[PDB]
Coordinates of C-alpha atoms (C1' of nucleotides) in Angstrom, one line a residue:
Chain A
X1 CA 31.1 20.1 -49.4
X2 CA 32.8 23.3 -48.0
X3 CA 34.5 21.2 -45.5
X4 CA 37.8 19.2 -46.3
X5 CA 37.5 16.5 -44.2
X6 CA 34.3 16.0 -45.3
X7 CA 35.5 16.3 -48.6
X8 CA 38.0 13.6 -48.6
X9 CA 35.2 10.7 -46.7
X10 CA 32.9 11.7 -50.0
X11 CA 35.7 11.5 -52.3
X12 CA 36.7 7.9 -50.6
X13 CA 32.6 6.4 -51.0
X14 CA 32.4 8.3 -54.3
X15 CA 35.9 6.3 -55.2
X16 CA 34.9 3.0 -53.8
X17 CA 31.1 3.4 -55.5
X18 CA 33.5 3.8 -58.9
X19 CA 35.6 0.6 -58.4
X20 CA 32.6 -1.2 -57.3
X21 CA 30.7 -0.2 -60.8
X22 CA 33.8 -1.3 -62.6
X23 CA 34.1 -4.5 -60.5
X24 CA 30.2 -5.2 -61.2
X25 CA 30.1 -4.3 -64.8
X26 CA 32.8 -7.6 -65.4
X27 CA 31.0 -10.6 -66.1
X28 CA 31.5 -14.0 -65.2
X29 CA 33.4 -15.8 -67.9
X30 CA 31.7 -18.7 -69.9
X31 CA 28.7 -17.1 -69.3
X32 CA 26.8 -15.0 -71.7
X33 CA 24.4 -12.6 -70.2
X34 CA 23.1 -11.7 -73.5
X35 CA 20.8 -14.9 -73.5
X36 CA 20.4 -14.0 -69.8
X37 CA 18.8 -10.7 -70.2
X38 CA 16.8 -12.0 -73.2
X39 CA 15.1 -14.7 -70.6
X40 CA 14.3 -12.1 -68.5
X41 CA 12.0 -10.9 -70.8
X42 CA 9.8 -13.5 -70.3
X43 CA 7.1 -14.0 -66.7
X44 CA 9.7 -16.2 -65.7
X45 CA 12.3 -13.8 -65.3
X46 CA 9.8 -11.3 -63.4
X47 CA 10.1 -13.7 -60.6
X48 CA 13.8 -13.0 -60.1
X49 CA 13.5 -9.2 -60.8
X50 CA 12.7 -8.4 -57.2
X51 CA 15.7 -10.3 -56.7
X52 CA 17.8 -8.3 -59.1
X53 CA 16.9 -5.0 -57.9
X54 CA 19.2 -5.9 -54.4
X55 CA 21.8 -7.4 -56.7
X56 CA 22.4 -3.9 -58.3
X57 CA 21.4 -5.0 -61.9
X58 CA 25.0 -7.2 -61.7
X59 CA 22.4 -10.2 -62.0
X60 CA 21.3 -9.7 -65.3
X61 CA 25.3 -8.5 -66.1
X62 CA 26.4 -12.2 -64.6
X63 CA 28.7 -10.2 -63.0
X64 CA 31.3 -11.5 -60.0
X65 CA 28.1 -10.7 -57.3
X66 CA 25.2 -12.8 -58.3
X67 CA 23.6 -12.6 -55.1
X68 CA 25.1 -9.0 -54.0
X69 CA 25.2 -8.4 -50.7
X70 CA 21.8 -10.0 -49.7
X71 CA 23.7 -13.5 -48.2
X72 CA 25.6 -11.4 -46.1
X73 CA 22.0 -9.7 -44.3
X74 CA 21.3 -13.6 -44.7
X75 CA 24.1 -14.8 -42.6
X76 CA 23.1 -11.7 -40.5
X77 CA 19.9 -13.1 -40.2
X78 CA 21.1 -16.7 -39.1
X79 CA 23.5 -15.7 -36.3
X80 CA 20.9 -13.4 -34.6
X81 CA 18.9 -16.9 -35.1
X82 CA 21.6 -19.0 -33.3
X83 CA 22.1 -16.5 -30.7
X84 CA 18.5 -16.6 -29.8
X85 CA 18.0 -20.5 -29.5
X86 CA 21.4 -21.4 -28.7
X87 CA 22.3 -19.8 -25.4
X88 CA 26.1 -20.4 -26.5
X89 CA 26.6 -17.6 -28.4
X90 CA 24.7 -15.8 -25.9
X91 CA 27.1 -16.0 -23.5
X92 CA 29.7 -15.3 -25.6
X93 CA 27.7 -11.8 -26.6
X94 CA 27.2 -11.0 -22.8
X95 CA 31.0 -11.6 -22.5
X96 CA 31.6 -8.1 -23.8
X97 CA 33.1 -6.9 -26.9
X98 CA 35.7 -9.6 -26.9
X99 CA 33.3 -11.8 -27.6
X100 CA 31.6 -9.4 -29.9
X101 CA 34.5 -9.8 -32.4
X102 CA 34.0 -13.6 -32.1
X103 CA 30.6 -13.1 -33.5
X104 CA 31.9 -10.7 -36.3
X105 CA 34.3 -13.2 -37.0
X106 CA 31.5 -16.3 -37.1
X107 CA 29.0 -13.7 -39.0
X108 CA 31.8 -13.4 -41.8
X109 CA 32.9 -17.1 -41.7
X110 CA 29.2 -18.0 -42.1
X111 CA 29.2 -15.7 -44.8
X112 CA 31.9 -17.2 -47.0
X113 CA 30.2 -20.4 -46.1
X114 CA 26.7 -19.1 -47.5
X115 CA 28.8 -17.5 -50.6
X116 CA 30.0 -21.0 -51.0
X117 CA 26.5 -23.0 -50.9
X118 CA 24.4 -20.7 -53.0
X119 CA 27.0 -20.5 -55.8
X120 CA 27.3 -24.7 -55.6
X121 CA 23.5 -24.4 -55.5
X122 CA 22.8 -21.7 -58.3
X123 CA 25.9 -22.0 -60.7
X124 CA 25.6 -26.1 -60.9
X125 CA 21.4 -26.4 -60.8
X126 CA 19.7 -23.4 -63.0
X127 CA 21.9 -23.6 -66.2
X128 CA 22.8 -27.0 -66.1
X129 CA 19.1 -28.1 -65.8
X130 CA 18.1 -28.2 -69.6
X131 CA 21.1 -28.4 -69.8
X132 CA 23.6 -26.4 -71.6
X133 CA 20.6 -23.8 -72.7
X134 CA 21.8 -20.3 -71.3
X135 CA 25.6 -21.3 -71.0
X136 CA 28.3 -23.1 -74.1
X137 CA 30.5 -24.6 -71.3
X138 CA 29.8 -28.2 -70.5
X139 CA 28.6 -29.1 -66.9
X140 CA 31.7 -30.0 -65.4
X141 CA 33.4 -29.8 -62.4
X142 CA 36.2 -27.3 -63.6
X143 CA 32.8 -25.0 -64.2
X144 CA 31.8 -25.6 -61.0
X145 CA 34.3 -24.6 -58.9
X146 CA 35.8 -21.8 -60.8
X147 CA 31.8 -20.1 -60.5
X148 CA 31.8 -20.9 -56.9
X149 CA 35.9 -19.4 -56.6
X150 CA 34.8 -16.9 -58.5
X151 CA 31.8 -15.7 -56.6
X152 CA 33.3 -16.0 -53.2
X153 CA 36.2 -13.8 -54.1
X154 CA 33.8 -11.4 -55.3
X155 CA 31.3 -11.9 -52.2
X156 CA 34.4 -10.9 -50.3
X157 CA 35.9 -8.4 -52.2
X158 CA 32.2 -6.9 -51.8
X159 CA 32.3 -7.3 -47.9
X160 CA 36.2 -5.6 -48.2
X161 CA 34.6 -2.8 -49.9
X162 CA 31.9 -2.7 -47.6
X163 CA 34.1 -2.3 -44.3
X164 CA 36.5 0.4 -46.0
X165 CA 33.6 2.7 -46.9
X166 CA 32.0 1.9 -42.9
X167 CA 35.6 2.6 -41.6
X168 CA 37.6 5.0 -43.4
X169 CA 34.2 7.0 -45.1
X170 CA 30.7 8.0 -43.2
X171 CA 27.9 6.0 -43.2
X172 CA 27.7 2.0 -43.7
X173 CA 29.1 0.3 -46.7
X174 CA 25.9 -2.0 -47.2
X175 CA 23.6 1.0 -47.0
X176 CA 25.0 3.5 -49.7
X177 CA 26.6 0.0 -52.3
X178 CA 23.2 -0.9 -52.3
X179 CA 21.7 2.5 -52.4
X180 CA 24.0 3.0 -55.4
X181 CA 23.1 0.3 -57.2
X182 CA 19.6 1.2 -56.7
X183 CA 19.3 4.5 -58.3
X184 CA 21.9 3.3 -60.8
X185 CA 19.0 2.3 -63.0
X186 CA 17.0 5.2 -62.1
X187 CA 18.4 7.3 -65.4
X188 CA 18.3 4.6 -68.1
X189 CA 14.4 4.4 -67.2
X190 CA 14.2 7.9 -67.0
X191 CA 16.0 8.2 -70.7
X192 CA 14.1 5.3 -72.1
X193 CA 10.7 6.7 -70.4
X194 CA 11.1 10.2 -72.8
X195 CA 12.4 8.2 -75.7
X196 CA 9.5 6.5 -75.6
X197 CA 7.0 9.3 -74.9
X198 CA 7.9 11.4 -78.1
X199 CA 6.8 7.6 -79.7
X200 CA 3.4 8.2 -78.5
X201 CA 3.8 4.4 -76.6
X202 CA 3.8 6.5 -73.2
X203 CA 1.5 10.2 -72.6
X204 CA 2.9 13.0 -71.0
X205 CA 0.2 13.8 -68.2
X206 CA 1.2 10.4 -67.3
X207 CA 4.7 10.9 -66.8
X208 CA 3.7 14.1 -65.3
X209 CA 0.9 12.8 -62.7
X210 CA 4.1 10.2 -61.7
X211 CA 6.7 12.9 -60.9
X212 CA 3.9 14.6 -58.7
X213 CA 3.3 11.6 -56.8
X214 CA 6.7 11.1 -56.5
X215 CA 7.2 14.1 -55.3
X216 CA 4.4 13.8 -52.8
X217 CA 5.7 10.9 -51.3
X218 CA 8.6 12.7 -50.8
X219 CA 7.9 15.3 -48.8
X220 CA 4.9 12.9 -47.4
X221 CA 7.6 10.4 -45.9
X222 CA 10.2 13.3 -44.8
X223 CA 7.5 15.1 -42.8
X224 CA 6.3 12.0 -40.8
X225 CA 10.1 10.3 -40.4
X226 CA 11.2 14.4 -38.1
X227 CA 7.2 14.0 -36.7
X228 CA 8.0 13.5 -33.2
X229 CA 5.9 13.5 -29.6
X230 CA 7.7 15.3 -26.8
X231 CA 6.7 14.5 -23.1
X232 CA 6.7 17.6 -21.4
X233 CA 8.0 17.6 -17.7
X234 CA 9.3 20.2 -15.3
X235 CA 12.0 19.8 -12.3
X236 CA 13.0 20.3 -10.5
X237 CA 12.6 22.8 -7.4
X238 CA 14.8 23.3 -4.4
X239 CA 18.4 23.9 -5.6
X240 CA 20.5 22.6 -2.8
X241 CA 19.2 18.6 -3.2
X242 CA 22.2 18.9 -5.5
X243 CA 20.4 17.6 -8.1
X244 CA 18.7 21.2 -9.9
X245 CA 19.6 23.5 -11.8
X246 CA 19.5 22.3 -15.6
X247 CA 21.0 23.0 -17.8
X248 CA 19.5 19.5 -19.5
X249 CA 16.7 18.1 -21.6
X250 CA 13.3 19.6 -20.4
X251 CA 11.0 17.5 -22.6
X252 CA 11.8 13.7 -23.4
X253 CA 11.6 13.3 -27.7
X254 CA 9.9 10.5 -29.1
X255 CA 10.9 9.5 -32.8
X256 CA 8.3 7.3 -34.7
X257 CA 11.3 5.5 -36.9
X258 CA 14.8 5.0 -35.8
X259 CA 15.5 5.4 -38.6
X260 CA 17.6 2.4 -40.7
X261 CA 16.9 0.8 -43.6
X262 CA 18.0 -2.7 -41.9
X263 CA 14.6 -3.9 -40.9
X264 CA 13.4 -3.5 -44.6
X265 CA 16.4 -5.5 -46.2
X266 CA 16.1 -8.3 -43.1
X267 CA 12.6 -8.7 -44.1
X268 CA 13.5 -8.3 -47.9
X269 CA 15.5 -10.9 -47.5
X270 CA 13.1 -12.9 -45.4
X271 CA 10.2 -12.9 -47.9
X272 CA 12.6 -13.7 -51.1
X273 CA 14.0 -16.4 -49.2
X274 CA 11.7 -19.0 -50.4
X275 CA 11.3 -16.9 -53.8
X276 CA 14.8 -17.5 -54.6
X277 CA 15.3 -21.2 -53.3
X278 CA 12.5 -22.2 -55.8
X279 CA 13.7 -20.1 -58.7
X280 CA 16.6 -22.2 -59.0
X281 CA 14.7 -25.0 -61.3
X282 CA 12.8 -23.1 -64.2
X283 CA 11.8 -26.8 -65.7
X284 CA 11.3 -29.9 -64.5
X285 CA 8.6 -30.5 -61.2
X286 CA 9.9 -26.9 -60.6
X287 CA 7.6 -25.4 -64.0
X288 CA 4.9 -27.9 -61.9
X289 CA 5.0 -26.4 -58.6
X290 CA 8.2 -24.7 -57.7
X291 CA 7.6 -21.6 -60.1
X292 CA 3.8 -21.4 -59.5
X293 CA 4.6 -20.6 -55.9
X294 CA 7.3 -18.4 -57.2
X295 CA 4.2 -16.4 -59.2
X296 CA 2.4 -16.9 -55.3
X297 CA 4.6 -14.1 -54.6
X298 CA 5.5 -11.4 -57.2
X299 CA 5.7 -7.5 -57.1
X300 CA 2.6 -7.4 -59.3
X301 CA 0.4 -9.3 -57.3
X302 CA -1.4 -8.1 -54.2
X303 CA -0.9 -11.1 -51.8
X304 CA 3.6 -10.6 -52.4
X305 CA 2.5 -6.8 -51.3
X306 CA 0.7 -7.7 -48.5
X307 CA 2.7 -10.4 -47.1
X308 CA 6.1 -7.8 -47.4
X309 CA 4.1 -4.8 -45.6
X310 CA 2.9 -7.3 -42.7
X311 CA 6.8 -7.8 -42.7
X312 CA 8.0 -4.4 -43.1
X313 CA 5.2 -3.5 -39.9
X314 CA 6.6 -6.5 -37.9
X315 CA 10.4 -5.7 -38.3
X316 CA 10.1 -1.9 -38.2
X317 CA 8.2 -2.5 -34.7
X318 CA 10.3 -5.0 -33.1
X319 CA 13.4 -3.0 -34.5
X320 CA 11.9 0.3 -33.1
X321 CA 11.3 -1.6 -29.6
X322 CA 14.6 -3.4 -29.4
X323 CA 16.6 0.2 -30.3
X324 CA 15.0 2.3 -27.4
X325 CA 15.3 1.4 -24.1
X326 CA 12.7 2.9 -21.3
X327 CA 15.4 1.3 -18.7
X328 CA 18.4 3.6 -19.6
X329 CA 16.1 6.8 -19.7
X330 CA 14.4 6.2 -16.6
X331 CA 18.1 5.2 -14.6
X332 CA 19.2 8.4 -16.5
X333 CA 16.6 10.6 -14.8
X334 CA 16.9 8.6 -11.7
X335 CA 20.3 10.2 -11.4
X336 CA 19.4 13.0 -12.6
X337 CA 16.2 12.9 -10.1
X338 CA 13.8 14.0 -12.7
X339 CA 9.8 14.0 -11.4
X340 CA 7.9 13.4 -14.5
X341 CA 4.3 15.5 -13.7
X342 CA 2.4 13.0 -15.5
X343 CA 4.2 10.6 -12.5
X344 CA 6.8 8.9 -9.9
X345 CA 9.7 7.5 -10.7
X346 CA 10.5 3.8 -11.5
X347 CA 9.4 0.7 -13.6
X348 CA 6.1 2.6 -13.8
X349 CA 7.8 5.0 -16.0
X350 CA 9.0 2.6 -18.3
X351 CA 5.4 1.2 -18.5
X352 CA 4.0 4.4 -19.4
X353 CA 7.1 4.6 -22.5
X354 CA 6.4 1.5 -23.7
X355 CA 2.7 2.4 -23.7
X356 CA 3.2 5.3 -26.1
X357 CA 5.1 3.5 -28.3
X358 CA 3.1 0.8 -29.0
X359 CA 0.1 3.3 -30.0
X360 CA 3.1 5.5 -32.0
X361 CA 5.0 2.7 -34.0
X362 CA 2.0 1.3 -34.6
X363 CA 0.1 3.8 -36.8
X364 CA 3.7 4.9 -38.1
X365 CA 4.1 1.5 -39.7
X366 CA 0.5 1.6 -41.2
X367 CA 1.5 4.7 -42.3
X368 CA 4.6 2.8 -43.5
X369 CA 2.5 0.7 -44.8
X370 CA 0.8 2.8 -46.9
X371 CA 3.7 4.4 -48.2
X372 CA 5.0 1.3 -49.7
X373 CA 1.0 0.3 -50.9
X374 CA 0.4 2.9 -53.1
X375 CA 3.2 2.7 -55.8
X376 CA 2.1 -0.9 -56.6
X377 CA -1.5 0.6 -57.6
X378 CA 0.2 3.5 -59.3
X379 CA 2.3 0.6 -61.5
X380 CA -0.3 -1.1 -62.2
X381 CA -3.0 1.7 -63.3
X382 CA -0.2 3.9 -64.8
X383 CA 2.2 1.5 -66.3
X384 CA 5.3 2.9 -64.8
X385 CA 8.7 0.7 -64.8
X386 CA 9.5 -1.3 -62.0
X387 CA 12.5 1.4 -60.7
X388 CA 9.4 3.5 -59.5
X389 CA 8.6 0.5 -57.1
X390 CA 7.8 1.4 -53.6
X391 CA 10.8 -0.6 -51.9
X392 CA 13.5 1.2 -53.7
X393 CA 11.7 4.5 -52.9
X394 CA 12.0 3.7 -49.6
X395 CA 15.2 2.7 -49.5
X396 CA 16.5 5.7 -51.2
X397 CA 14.4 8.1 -48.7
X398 CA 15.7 5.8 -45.2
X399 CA 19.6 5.8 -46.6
X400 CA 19.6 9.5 -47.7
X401 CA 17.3 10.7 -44.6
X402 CA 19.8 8.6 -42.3
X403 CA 22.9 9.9 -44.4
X404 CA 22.1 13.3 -44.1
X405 CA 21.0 13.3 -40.3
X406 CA 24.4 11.3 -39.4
X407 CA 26.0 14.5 -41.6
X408 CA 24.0 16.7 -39.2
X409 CA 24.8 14.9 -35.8
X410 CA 28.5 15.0 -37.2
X411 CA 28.4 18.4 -37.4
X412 CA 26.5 19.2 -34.7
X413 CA 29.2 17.1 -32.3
X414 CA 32.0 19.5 -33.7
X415 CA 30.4 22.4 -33.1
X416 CA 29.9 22.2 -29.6
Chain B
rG1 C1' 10.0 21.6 49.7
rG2 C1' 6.8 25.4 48.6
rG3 C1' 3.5 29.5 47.7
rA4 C1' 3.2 28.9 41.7
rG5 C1' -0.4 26.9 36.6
rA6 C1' 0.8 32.8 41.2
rA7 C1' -0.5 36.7 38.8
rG8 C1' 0.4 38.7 33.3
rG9 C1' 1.9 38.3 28.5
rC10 C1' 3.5 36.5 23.6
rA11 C1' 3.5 32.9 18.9
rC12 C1' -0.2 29.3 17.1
rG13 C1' -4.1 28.1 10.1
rC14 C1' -2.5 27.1 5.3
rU15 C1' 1.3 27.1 1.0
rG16 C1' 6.6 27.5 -0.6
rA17 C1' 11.7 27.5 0.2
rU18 C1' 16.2 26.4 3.6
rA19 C1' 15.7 20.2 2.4
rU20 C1' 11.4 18.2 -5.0
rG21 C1' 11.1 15.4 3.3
rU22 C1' 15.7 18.4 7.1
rA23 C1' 17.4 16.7 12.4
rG24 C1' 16.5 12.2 14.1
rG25 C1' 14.4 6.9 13.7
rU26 C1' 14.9 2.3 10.8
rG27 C1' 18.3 0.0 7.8
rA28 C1' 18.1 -3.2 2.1
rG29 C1' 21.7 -4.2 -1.8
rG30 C1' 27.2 -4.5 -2.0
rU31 C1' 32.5 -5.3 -0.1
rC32 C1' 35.4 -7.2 3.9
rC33 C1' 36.0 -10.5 8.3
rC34 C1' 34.6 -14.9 10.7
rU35 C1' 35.6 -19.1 16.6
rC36 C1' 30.7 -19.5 9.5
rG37 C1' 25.9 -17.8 12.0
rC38 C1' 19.4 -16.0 14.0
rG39 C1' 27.3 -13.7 13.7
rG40 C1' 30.7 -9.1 13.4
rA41 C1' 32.4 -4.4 10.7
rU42 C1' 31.7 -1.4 6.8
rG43 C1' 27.9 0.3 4.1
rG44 C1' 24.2 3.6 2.8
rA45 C1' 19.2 2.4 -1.4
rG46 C1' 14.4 2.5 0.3
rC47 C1' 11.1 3.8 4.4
rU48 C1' 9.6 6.9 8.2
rG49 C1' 9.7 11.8 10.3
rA50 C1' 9.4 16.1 14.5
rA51 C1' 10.9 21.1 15.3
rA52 C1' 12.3 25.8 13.7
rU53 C1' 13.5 30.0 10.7
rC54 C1' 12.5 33.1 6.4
rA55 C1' 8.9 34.4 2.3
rG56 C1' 4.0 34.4 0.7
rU57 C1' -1.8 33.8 1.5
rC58 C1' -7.0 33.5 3.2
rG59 C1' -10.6 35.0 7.0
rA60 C1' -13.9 39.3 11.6
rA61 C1' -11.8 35.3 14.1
rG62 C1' -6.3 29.6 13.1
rA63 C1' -5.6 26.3 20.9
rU64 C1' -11.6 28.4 15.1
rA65 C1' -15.6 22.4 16.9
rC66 C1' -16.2 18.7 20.9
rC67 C1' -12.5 19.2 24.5
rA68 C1' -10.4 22.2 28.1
rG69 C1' -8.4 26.2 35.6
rC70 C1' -12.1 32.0 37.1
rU71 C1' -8.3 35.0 39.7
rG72 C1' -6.6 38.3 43.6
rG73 C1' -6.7 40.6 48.8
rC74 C1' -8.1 40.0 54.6
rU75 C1' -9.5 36.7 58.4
rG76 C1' -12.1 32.2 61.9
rC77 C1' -11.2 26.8 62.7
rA78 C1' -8.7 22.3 61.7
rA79 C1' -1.8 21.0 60.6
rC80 C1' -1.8 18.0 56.4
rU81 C1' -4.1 12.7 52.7

RNA sequence: GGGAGAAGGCACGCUGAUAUGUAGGUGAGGUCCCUCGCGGAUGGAGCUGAAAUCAGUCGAAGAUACCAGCUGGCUGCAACU
């Protein structure tokens, strides 16, 4: 805050976080979100409110992102797919960064081609079902592709906005839009939960026992994300093996997360995947099937929890194991010729690494786990609205956590 | 040539550093050359590894056992194995 040139990168997000509110509270025209929001009302629109939460609350709006930024994770999601079954793109990857700018380029095509599909697919099959229920305008093609136009200029737009605040502003784009949108709906609850409480619909204590817990999550989560294990190891002896003296790292840290936010919206979007492909036909053989394993999975119901923590443990573990690599430490204390007491050098080092962290990412993703477990008991048993859901908390601690500690590292790099 | 191992004396263990194993010994990967091979040069990873010096430490005793010359002076005879 003190800091000017730190001043101007928050000004810039700040800035881009306004145009992206203005941009999201403009609706689509021909479409009336009024009869939107009323359907929502409903237990068929609670399947698509795990799906709005990502979206910003621009879903409800009918705004120019109907799926936010979740196809572009997506296409993400489909390129690290094709570059592990097609070796093609893997040589292309291992062909340095020349190639890595080929894969941006692909990611961003695939994309726009994504955008393109899912607006066909939405915009022509939900409202046009019945049809004419939700929307005036007739199904035509002039509908069609001035929703799909529409919703690939504002996919892009989106993605624009998204590399400006990476590039000329600190942290990623992705992370603090969607972090935004997130705890954009944070004070409307908040209002509409004391409105309410003075009606005597909702108690105090209640209110009060939720803050608490809250607030013990909090500080729960931010004192086991800085946990760490340190490996303790002294070298080296005899100073004229020009190795000795340092002047380095005497003990080897060990951080239980990362930490990113990436492996919870990969698996967010892996898990809503098939929730959002079936909530495309509300009537129909869809009403028959379709939307009763659409209510298979749902933030109120156990098995949707169970199935996303299993996800969340699966992708924070591989995504933990693929970050840190034993090979670069133990070739960077080769060099160095560090003797780990404890050891001797080689792939017997890397072993031994690999060995903690499997027992350390482990329990840190049940504790993860847990985390994420207990505000769907706490809905249910205390009412609370669905912006006190565990995956937004979540989200909000990882992107502020990971905000503040890039701040920190920034910081720390100008200093010294 | 010998006599001579003459006689007589000195250090000797362990641990650390000089060097997280040195001097040497071996010689991978790589690059180059080739009359292209079980080839040549470069190359130094790994592996092996004395000796010494300095500092410390234990014991009455460090060639701690088994192992492993008694030595010197005069003379007879036979040169010698």
């Amino acid at each position: 805050g003190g800091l000017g040139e730190l001043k101007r990168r928050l000004l810039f997000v700040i800035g881009a976080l306004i145009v992206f509110r203005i941009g999201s509270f403009i609706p689509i025209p021909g479409i009336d979100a009024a009869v939107l929001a009323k359907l929502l009302e409903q237990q068929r629109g609670t399947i698509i409110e795990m799906f709005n939460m990502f979206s910003g609350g621009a879903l409800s709006r009918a705004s120019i992102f109907a799926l936010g930024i979740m196809p572009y994770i997506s296409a993400s999601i489909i390129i690290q797919l094709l570059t592990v079954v097609h070796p093609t793109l893997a040589e292309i990857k291992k062909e340095g960064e020349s190639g890595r700018r080929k894969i941006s380029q692909y990611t961003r095509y695939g994309t726009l081609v994504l955008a393109i599909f899912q607006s066909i697919g939405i915009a022509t099959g939900l409202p046009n079902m019945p049809g004419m229920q939700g929307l005036v305008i007739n199904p035509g093609f002039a509908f069609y592709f001035t929703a799909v136009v529409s919703l690939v200029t504002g996919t892009m737009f989106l993605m624009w906005l998204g590399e400006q605040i990476t590039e000329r502003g600190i942290g990623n784009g992705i992370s603090i839009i969607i972090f935004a949108g997130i705890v954009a709906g944070l004070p409307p609850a908040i209002a509409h939960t004391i409105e309410q409480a003075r009606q005597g619909d909702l108690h105090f204590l209640v209110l009060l026992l939720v803050a608490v817990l809250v607030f013990a999550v909090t500080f729960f989560v931010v004192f086991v994300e800085r946990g760490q294990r340190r490996i303790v190891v002294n070298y080296a002896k005899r100073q004229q093996g020009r190795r000795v003296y340092a002047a380095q790292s005497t003990h080897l840290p060990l951080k239980v997360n990362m930490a990113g936010v990436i492996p919870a919206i990969f698996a967010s979007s892996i898990i809503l995947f098939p929730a959002t492909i079936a909530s495309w036909f509300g009537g129909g053989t869809g009403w028959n099937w379709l939307t009763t394993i659409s209510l298979y999975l749902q933030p109120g119901q156990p098995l949707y929890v169970l199935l996303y923590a299993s996800a969340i443990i699966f992708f924070c573990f591989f995504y933990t194991a693929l970050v840190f690599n034993p090979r670069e430490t133990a070739d960077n204390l080769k060099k160095s010729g560090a003797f780990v007491p404890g050891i001797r050098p080689g792939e017997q080092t890397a072993k031994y690494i690999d060995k903690v962290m499997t027992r350390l990412t482990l329990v840190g993703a049940l504790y993860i786990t847990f985390i994420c477990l207990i505000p769907e008991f706490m809905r249910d048993a205390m009412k609370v609205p669905f912006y006190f859901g565990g995956t937004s908390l979540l989200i909000v601690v990882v992107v502020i956590m990971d905000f503040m500690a890039q701040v920190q590292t920034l910081m720390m790099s100008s200093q010294y």
